[PDB]
């Protein structure tokens, strides 16, 4: 089985062409392949399939390291788009794909970045889910003794975004866990710590739901920019610097989808025995 | 650059044929390649070279994930011997090789395992290094309130081997880091927890110097059997069961080299563009 190893800002994938190859997985096999010493070594497996539909170019599925299928992953989307172009499975700039989260068009740019339509940010508390009276630009939250001002938004997953003076001194290790499982977040939240450098440039650290600080959370980058836009702090195109590198977010506000442009690195190609 | 990913039940290798292609590394490139997320992901890099002496079939060298060269007897030997055969660099089953540790003959058995001559175990405390009055078969060591009885031996690297009733109930997690950096080991020690099942069979867990428990430590398996042989507990041929699988150790005692036989698994082949 031919595969490619890729990463989107350090979130790493085994990617497989199941369009031109017969490719068979079981949950146990995926677990073995994910193992960094005994296998290929990856966070997620992305399998590329034919569309079975004349209005689609591909289908793709993503499996986690435990061998179960995953719903939305836009690091996934970027690796997918570059993979099908690098492997010659398509030559299209605008790639139509179906996924477990529905249908999408991905655009591969001239500088080999991939632009993802992440949908319209939903600020409605019930959609997050977030306990509040109603939607507000800024909420006051208590995190034990500390008073926190934040914005809260759903990108399909829940985000709490806090402005900080300096991401490097932000109390991520202490405030992150307290907010991630705060009583006001029935399904927990990703906690973003956002430093506004210019209206066009933020630095960001994200304490991810059930994971703690990660190198790059693309959905947190979208959420921080959506919140910062709504709060009057940010322009409509914003450079986001995460620990793993750069994303560029574009959003014209309510009534519009938010776009996330980011890299996908191709590390090596392999063939596995089996 | 073509490469193969392999392992010998424990630490994994990126293995590269520098015979049929030009292979160029820098310490920083090795570090980037070793990175599990951003690179290939491996503990060590094994480079297979043509021989520089007409008396040898190959030379090989090994670098760690920091990009510096490792010189440990038998390290990567099983993967090397299986690699040269599976890559069609040789058809020999007795393979003469030079390394940073000198020359060796490696033997690929009929069931595709590899037999490595690991040299003669050295029980001299100065060679470990180990602080002691003189070589003894058993030492008493202090670990918290607990008295530990152990044997101590060098296989090129330092080992402390403790006999336990059951590896599963062995206090590896607590006793292991205490012995690993014990003040009596100036350069730290690999800590073996050895359950003698019978004279020909042990179970073993190893808490490795600067890494904690691993799935298989070949040199730890050697050391455990050497110590068990010296202590009168073990036969000359011993099956060793580690969490990662099985090694077999043969040693006729002082005056003889110790031999370790074990598998190498080929996981996948790859190609990486290096600019």
UniProtKB/Swiss-Prot annotation, chain A:
Gene label: dapF
Q: What is its main location?
A: cytoplasm
Q: Which family does it belong to?
A: Belongs to the diaminopimelate epimerase family.
Identification of the protein by name: Diaminopimelate epimerase
Q: Where is this site: Important for dimerization?
A: 268
Endpoints of the signal sequence? none
Pathway-wise, it operates in: Amino-acid biosynthesis; L-lysine biosynthesis via DAP pathway; DL-2,6-diaminopimelate from LL-2,6-diaminopimelate: step 1/1
Q: Which InterPro entries match?
A: DAP_epimerase_AS, DAP_epimerase_DapF
Q: Where is the active site?
A: 73 (proton donor), 217 (proton acceptor)
Q: What is the additional note?
A: DapF utilizes a two-base mechanism involving a pair of cysteine residues (Cys-73 and Cys-217).
Entry keywords, A to Z:
Amino-acid biosynthesis, Cytoplasm, Isomerase, Lysine biosynthesis
E.C. designation(s): 5.1.1.7
Activity modulation comment: Inhibited by 2-(4-amino-4-carboxybutyl)aziri-dine-2-carboxylate (aziDAP) and iodoacetamide.
One GO BP annotation of this record:
lysine biosynthetic process via diaminopimelate
Q: Does the keyword Amino-acid biosynthesis apply?
A: yes
Query: How does it associate, per the subunit comment?
Result: Homodimer.
Could you tell me what reaction this enzyme catalyses? Answer: (2S,6S)-2,6-diaminopimelate = meso-2,6-diaminopimelate
Has keyword Amino-acid biosynthesis? yes
Q: Which Pfam families match?
A: DAP_epimerase
Q: What happens when the gene is disrupted?
A: Cells lacking this gene show an unusual large LL-diaminopimelic acid (LL-DAP) pool and an important variations of the LL-DAP/meso-DAP ratio incorporated in the peptidoglycan.
Where is this protein localized, as stated in its record?
A: Cytoplasm
Natural source organism: Escherichia coli (strain K12)
Recorded GO cellular component terms are: cytosol
Site note Could be important to modulate the pK values of the two catalytic cysteine residues applies to: 159, 208
Task: Name the job this protein performs.
Answer: Involved in the succinylase branch of the L-lysine biosynthesis and in the biosynthesis of the pentapeptide incorporated in the peptidoglycan moiety. Catalyzes the stereoinversion of LL-2,6-diaminopimelate (L,L-DAP) to meso-diaminopimelate (meso-DAP).
The top EC class, named as a word, is isomerase
